[PDB]
Amino acid sequence: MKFGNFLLTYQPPELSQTEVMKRLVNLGKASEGCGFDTVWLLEHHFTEFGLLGNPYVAAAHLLGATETLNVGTAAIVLPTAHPVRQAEDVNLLDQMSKGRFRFGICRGLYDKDFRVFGTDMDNSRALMDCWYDLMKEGFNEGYIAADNEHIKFPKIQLNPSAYTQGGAPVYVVAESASTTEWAAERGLPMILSWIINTHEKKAQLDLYNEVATEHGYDVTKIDHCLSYITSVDHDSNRAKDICRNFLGHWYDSYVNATKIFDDSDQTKGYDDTNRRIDYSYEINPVGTPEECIAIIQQDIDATGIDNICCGFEANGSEEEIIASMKLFQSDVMPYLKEKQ
Amino acid sequence: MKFGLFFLNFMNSKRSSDQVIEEMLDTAHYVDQLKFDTLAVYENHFSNNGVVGAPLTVAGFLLGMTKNAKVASLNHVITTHHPVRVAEEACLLDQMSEGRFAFGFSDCEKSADMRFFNRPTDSQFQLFSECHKIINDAFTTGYCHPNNDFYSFPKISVNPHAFTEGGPAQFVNATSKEVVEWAAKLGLPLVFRWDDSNAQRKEYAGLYHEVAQAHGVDVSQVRHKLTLLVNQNVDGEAARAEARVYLEEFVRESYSNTDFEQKMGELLSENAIGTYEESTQAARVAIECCGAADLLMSFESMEDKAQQRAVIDVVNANI
Fold first, then answer.
1. Residues of chain A positioned with their CB less than 8 A from the CB of B16
2. What is the DSSP code (8-state) at residue B10?
3. CA A218 to CA A224: how far, in whole Å?
4. Are the CB atoms for A37 and A4 separated by under 8 Å?
5. What residues pair up with A170 in beta bridges, in sequence order?
6. Residue B38 in 3-state DSSP?
7. Residue ranges of the domains in chain A?
8. Within 13 Å of residue B106, how many CA atoms lie on the same side as its CB?
9. How many Å apart are CA B120 and CA B79, to the nearest integer?
10. Which residue of A164, A182, B82, B201 is 20 to 30 Å from B314, comparing CA positions?
């Protein structure tokens, strides 16, 4: 199937920013050496949760550094940037890499991103939906324009021209179902939380499906994704331990990210949470290989999806992060099998 | 005394986005093993004269792809952008490549662009001057607090912070008299435009100097660069015909029938176009008129790869 390495660029309290940038590049490289066929990047501004707030650029560095590896942006936050500028970037990316770029998009979760990038807070879905069109249009026509409460710019030419016909492959990181719907309407492949479970997942699908179908798509080729967090070790106990700590941090970090909350600044115009996450390691590849293998097949056999992408930063260190990917490469990788 | 390349990536009816983009990449790969110390990329939007709008990206790709050259964005128009993006991108580039990225920016030239990006003009310069403050703050502090008539948001950290203390090496592009002033005050190098007349570079050059003086800065150190187009052929007429065919649109675009003929002949004579003896001589005068410590040439116009590639070795073997 398809394997992917997921990278957040989360900064551990013991690693300095530099340290993290270095480890970040090393992993991007090592990826393929470990049997992974795509490296996926998360985008995140101003905090330790993610230091890498410009996936296109990062992507270009690794894409350039490699012959065959694939790179994707797990989550480009659609609204916060200018469609034209994004189109040019994806297009450059696609053309320079010769089609090795995966354009995973997302809607936008933190406020901050919006209060600073100066974008429309409520319209979050509209925007994404709209930006997407312009971009789309630029993708095969070769031109772009507007005319809405969103933006307004006249017909311009677009360079360079898309390498991959119709543009780079698009993916949606969707949790909400309004969003599950949105995707389906255009039948886009997608990425699944690692916080949810089998039923939950399988259930999002169906939903995706009744739409996909209503619009005549072949659910047979849409490549979705099983995204997880991984912890491969022989001591199931360490694997899970380590993992438990990670999620404290993650969670805490995650929370803090709801920061700029002291009212002396207006987003007025001119120009929250879920439930238990600390136990979500029970539904992901954490523990011995045997344990990982099972947990995975299960989601597989239930969705049909053959692309699972994992994140190993939890092991923290650069070394451990590797061992646990090599472990997986030898011990989990071989043993998985396609759907029903 | 440093040398290097630069790509404008002009596309035509004869060379397409795909062609150019590759050729560029193809060349950066070659040069890498030579003594060229820098590669720069020209930012251009919505026309055939420059098939790149995000110089920082390409920069990343080339950075990821090379082992020896510093790589730099030639004229990143920060005037039409969000200083944060900019800063994040820049430190990022500095961080990932570990000190091999140089940051050349600039104010907005084409009027339009400014319009297309909601940029009013009544503030064009101040707006520019500002973006830089910030970009610059971050670089130095790892943080920022705008609160200006241009931009306001709460204070923030701007990650990744920056490898290089103070930030990557910076430079400004010499587009207006008022910019060389400002730039001089902070005592920061410039990059002289190959499309500008020898005289122009002079004024500016001098201007810089005069101002550097009057305020205090000891620019004895500052190193500026200059960009020039190279094109040599043992048949001077040929090198001239090719180049004009090559700049034809650039000129109708940028120097609006001001005397297409006049302007053109001048670039045709001031750039390093001709036969070796013609080319080499012209370089020389250009350098002298503006006093640049660094020369960034561009061998693009040369259609035949072998010759183009043969022009490079030559310029290489010099050193």
1. 161
2. B
3. 13
4. yes
5. A103
6. strand
7. 1-340
8. 23
9. 11
10. B201
Adjacent-strand bridge partners of B159: none
Distance in Å, alpha carbon of A246 to nearest chain B alpha carbon: 21
The closest alpha carbon to A72, from A163, A173, A142, A221, belongs to A173
Instruction: Give yes or no for a contact between A252 and A47, defined as CB atoms under 8 angstroms apart.
Output: no
Give the chain B residue nearest A11 (alpha carbons).
B160
Instruction: Supply B277's token pair.
Output: 């003896």
Residue that the structure tokens 């500008």 belong to? B196
CATH 3.40.50.720 fits A1-340, yes or no: no
Distance CA B228, CA B268 (A): 11
User: B226 touching A, CB under 8 A?
Assistant: no
DSSP designation for A280: G
What is the pairing mode between strands B190-192 and B169-174? parallel
Contact between residue B317 and residue B25 where contact means Cβ atoms under 8 Å apart: no
Catalytic residue list contains A61: no
Q: Which of B43, B96, B100, B101 to mutate to test the interface with A (most CBs of A within 10 A)?
A: B96
CB-based burial label for A340 (10 Å; 0-12, 13-18, 19+): exposed
Q: State the DSSP H helix or E strand holding residue A97, giving kind and residue range, or none if neither.
A: helix A83-97
What whole-number distance in Å separates Cα of residue A92 and Cα of residue A204? 34
Longest dimension (CA), chain B: 62
d(CA A77, CA A51): 15
Phi-psi sector, B27: left (phi>0), alpha (psi -120 to 50), beta = alpha
Chains A, B: CB contacts within 8 A come to 146
Using alpha carbons, select from B153, B86, B307, B306 the residue that is nearest to residue A85: B86
The verdict on whether A264 is a catalytic residue reads no
Fold of the CATH domain B1-319: TIM Barrel (3.20.20)
A106 is catalytic: yes
Q: Which two tokens stand for residue B215?
A: 């305020």
Q: What is the resolution of this structure in A?
A: 2.4
Residues of B in contact with A57 (CB under 8 A): 56-57, 60, 89, 92-93
Residues 110-149 of B with CB under 8 A from A: 116-118
Q: Is residue B284 helix, strand or coil?
A: helix
Amino acid identity at A306: D
**Three-class DSSP category at B180:** helix
CB-CB contact of B76 with B85 (8 Å): no
Distance between CA A238 and CA B6 in Å, rounded?
53
Q: Say yes or no for a CB contact (<8 Å) between B95 and A18.
A: yes
Closest CA to A309 of A285, A289, A327, A340: A285
Check if the beta carbon of residue B91 is closer than 8 Å to that of residue B138.
yes
> How would you class A202 by CB atoms within 10 Å of its CB: exposed for 0-12, middle for 13-18, buried for 19 or more?
middle
Task: Name the structure determination technique.
Answer: X-ray
Q: Which residue has the tokens 């002289």?
A: B192
Bridge partners, B6 (sequence order): B40
Known catalytic residue at A31: no
Q: For A280, phi and psi rounded to 5 degrees?
A: -65, 0
- List the alpha helices (DSSP H) in A105-235: 111-117, 124-141, 177-186, 198-214
DSSP structure string for A76-92: EESTTS-HHHHHHHHHH
